[PDB]
Amino acid sequence: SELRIILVGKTGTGKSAAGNSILRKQAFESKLGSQTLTKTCSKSQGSWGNREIVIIDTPDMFSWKDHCEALYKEVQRCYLLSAPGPHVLLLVTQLGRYTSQDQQAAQRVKEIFGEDAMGHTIVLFTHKEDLGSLMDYMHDSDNKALSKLVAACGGRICAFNNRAEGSNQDDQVKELMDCIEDLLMEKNGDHYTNGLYSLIQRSKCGPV
């Protein structure tokens, strides 16, 4: 009954904060500061409905240049923590701040997870409070790069205010879970997979 989610995207967009919003607890270190905080992948979990939500937070692996002390190692850690594959890649972006570095992050997502990764990706917009409606912003946006990203993700978008509490927090998480359910329906309940994921899964069952 696991539902596995990997938080991906540019550094500082509110990845760790989003994981915290979803799990409704302080699972991942998140705070104000100009430098990158998350330096290693982390895993946490919680229940929602009748599924165990499993979330993998990520360091700055999606930057164009290597900004990791051990990039290859952290990618491997990400794979091992999410095996046999994520149900969702949550591509975290800050609303009104989709830059070339965000475009780079999306390319790095495809490099690390495969050219088909976008098919299991949902675009999460953080800083929702900075808005009208999310749909209205999208239509009014002349950010062509962002429109391409959203189209590549089949129009699957959701907005969070990571500082949301109580009922507001609930509603936004409900919205995300609705998005996830719709994606899972489209994919016949399957998680994302690729050759490295299947290789890990086979290795784990051991020599015969």
Q: For ligand GTP, give the closer residue by CB, 38 or 82.
A: 38
| Shortest distance (Å) from residue 58 CB to ligand GTP | 8
Rounded Cα distance between 137 and 205, Å, is 48
Strand partners, 88: 5
Binding site for ligand GTP (CB under 6 A): 11-17, 30-32, 36-38, 60, 126-127, 160-163
Rounded Cα distance between 22 and 15, Å, is 11
17 annotated binding-site participant = yes
Rounded Cα distance between 101 and 172, Å, is 26
Which residues from 33-92 bind Mg ion, rule CB under 5 A? 37-38
| Shortest distance (Å) from residue 50 CB to ligand GTP | 28
11 annotated binding-site participant = yes
| Shortest distance (Å) from residue 21 CB to Mg ion | 13
Q: Counting contacts by CB under 5 A, is residue 16 touching Mg ion?
A: yes
> Which of 29-37, 107-115, 139-147, 156-164 is the region at the interface with Mg ion (rule: CB under 5 A)?
29-37
| Shortest distance (Å) from residue 154 CB to ligand GTP | 23
- Measured from the Cβ of residue 111, the count of other Cβ atoms closer than 10 Å reads 13
38 annotated binding-site participant = yes
Rounded Cα distance between 23 and 149, Å, is 26
Main-chain dihedrals φ then ψ at residue 22, nearest 5 degrees: -70, -40
Print burial letters for 115-142: b (CB count within 10 Å at least 16), e (below 16).
eebbbbbbbbbbbbeeeeeeeebbeeee
Q: For Mg ion, give the closer residue by CB, 54 or 150.
A: 54
106 annotated binding-site participant = no
Residue stretches of the annotated binding site: 11-17, 30, 37-38, 127-129, 162
Residue stretches of the annotated binding site for GTP: 11-17, 30, 37-38, 127-129, 162
